[model samples]
Target chain A: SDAQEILSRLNSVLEAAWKTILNLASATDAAEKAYKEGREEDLATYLDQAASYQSQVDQYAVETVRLLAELKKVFPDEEADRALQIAEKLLKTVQEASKTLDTAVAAAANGDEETFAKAFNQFVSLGNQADTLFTQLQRTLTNLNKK
Target chain B: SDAQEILSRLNSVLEAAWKTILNLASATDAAEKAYKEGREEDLATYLDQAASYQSQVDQYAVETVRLLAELKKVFPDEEADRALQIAEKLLKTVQEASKTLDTAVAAAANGDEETFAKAFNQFVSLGNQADTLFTQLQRTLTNLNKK
Candidate 1:
């Protein structure tokens, strides 16, 4: 019962979290470009906003994970295992994306145009990575009832 | 040659702008989640964090666009037209996504699950949108390569 309830709740949370994260990533890319172009004043404005957004992302991510762990408590061992796997995949997606962002930031700062471009491009690639993993996770976990 | 260069610059500027928009969107999501989870500290922290990131984004976007616009002064008619088109497209995407987000937040607040799901799914769809448009815009602006 706990597992079922949490699973349902997670469905919504994932939807919300993904929506918000993508939005934040979009803004970050924009602000970074502005700053690099020497628009100090504009950069200040967007940077301020971006800081606030990151905080939101951290909050949502932590809460969602907390709920997932709670869901695991009530499920059968098999159910718990499945949920954890899904959670791990999601967690990894975020982690990898975060790493890519750091790489992008560094490359951009170094002023190595090619490297910066590639890293920046890869920064968005995490979307593909997360999308693929999330689809699989959703499909696999949704099958619990049948099993 | 000038035409091609101007177009190239415009496309890059657009890319930077879109990225900033997405990042801001993420910050908002984080803030909302923190509020819901009763994480008073994170909520306070995230609000500040998101603001900072946004300032960085805005700074980059504005400067990049300003430079691109300056480049337009020397560009030939054909290239200038193309560059403008690129900027328009990039702006459109950011605007559309923003509107969708507004709706999403409203839907979630109103308990309209269907609307919320659609809005949330849009977030997941962002990667594809960013990639496809970036590719097309760059491909069309090849003649404008600043190098």
Candidate 2:
């Protein structure tokens, strides 16, 4: 595949990853809203849904990384490779958020509002980092293709 | 208001504006989805909702700029003032998006898919700029507080 083809494929994977993450964010939002309303059952349900979405996002990250590896061998773009490196870090950051989500899950299950709130805050922080990196990756990839 | 008070108020206005824009974006997303599904009524309904949200954002922006003017008279920080100037331009950019949204509304009403899509794309572009400036303003304000 040519550079455009390779870039296009990579973008598709990124788009899919973002869509899954979007769903994850909405679920997480629902959980927070439920918590604020003092609805423990609703909080647990939404958090569990968020967790499932996160798992889907993780699968997309796995696919993205795998695609990056294959394209690195076949496509060999120095600039794009740098983006892949950035993407690797971005995926790791998302993994960190996933861990925070686990804490949130436990907090919710135990009905520990304080712990859950703090865990939610940490998860949001990690999510912000991942969100920035995701947009950065997309911008970098788009620029690389333009060149 | 003290410097901290002014900054906090500005941040609050910014946060509220963003919340409205978030809802606006979701409505716009629904509009696009409905368009894709050939649901003209749903598309019109969603687009109208988005337009309303944009108006609310515009009002917040008006309040924000007014506050900035007031703060400039009372508080003195060269760096914070610079951010305010940047914010002025950012708000103008959002105004540009408002115009584009109007185009989208008209296009939707007329059932002009091509025009509506192009307008939506432009609105998204302006939104990206405003989003960047919003985050930048938050960062700058936070740092200034730390000082």
Candidate 3:
């Protein structure tokens, strides 16, 4: 009963957490767009907001990791175990995204345009990776009940 | 039984998580110092590393919040509930610190000296707040099993 309840709640929490990562992705994109347009003021604002979304993502992802860990122990199903593994990867993905994006912003700030460009590209790649994994993790956890 | 076990592990996890926040505080301080010295390269590196520590803090803090929630439901102590409240505040503190530090980096990059100075000062204040709350929460949670 506890396992079932945790499974259900974990799904909900994981779903919500991943969405914030998407929001973070968007914020970084907006910040880059502002920079490309030479809109210095908007670039600052967009990056600040990106950091805001990042803060939310951090909260949810951490929450997801905790729940996933619990689900593995209480549930002990193969699906739950696998879901836990995916969540950990997902956590690292978000962490990397934050770091790379920060690096990009820092690089741009220092007029290191070359480093900024490279870091921003890496950030985008990471964001896409996060999107794919988040979707897959959601499906994996959701299907745990069907079995 | 699960509650007691979760309680033990949660305390351990929380302890580790809060420590990373301290590391984050140091990174910000290093970044600021680098900036003051006009060590542009070091400033970039320190701020980037600050983001790295920030990512870890996000993970641990999020994990703490999730466990704190479960602790409230399963363990169901007044102390656990209070610990949850403090952790939520702690999460907010970390989030605010990330944003302020990012703002400081951005401001300095954009040649907004006044804003940079103000934001950097606010970041230090938030860091102090995080330290105090983190210590208090640790005490609260550690004492839970003593009862």
Candidate 4:
């Protein structure tokens, strides 16, 4: 009963994260275009969108931590410990990624080409990090479902 | 002329990387389903697909290296140096990601859930690293195009 309940909530959080990431991706595209095209107003608007997505991502990261805590409470063992470690790593990465995006957005706003370029690249790197985390989290959840 | 040629080649390699990543994502999805359903054959097929995509990723990484070499030789400026650094980092991350995937595939074949979970998580971490690299490379390419 506890696992089932926790899983339901966890699933919701994961869905929220996915949605936020989608929004972030779209915003990133717009921001990049604005930067390239020298559309100052459009760039500002997309940068705002990006910042909002970053906040949502940060929110999802927090929710994920809570989810992990609940999972630990339900299944306290070596298995839980391993899963928790992975989940924690994922949370940290999500946080770092949000930070990277923040910097890129700020750089874009300031018209700092070199910094924007570097920050944007870091933001993209976060994508791969999150992907790996999500894959492992799914695998972890499947194992829990079996238990 | 040199910048034009290098940018063109770099873009192609970047496109290749994206295609391979897309294939990898699809294979990962299939692999997860196979694991969850206990479908051994499907797992095998997905793993095969993963391997195929990984090889393509490796090839793209190699091509990226060649592209970077060309950039360095042609530009030999601060921008080229920065881009070279990013490109190298991206190549390293791609190689590392393939290794992580290899481990995940092996763990899956052995039905080692624990190993699979851990490897999958590591794979995510590598994903972030590679993402940062790719982002930087893209930015660098954009800058080169300007020149």
Best by lDDT: 2
- lDDT for each candidate structure: 0.58, 0.77, 0.71, 0.69
Give one digit per residue, the lDDT tens place, for model 2 in A1-147. 555566677888887777666656656666767677786766776777777878777776676676667667776777668778878888798888889999999987787778988989999888888889888878877767775
Pairs that collide, model 4: A125-B128, A125-B131, A125-B132, A128-B127, A128-B128, A129-B127, A129-B128, A132-B124
TM-score of each model, paired residue for residue: 0.41, 0.51, 0.50, 0.48
CAPRI quality level assigned to candidate 2 from its DockQ score: incorrect
In candidate 3, list every pair of residues with a backbone clash: none
Task: Give the per-residue lDDT digits (tens) of candidate 2, residues B54-141.
Answer: 8888888777777777777776556768777867877798899899999989987887879988998999899889888878877766
Off by over 4 Å in 4: B1-147
Model 3: residues with Cα > 4 Å off, grouped in runs: B1-147
What tens-digit string does per-residue lDDT give for candidate 4 at A39-142?
A: 86677678667766765665565556556666777778877667667766676676567556645544443345688789888887887788799779878877
Positional deviation of residue A25's Cα in model 3 after best superposition, in angstroms = 3.4
The fraction of reference A/B contacts recovered in model 2 reads 0.00
Ranking by lDDT: 2, 3, 4, 1
Instruction: Give the C-alpha miss distance for residue B116 in model 4, angstroms.
Output: 31
TM-score, chain B, model 1, is: 0.52
Lowest lDDT block of 10, candidate 3 chain A: A103-112
lDDT of 3 by residue, B1-147 (tens): 366786777777877876776677788878878888988657756765775687567556655665677677686466877988887777667667766765665544434579878987887898788888888888887788774
Error of 3 at B136 (Å): 28
- Which pairs clash in model 2? none
Q: Please provide, for model 4 over B20-107, each residue's C-alpha lDDT reduced to its tens digit, 9 standing for 90 to 100.
A: 8888878877877887898865776676677567656755765576566666777656477777667666655665665566556545
TM-score of chain B of each: 0.52, 0.90, 0.87, 0.86
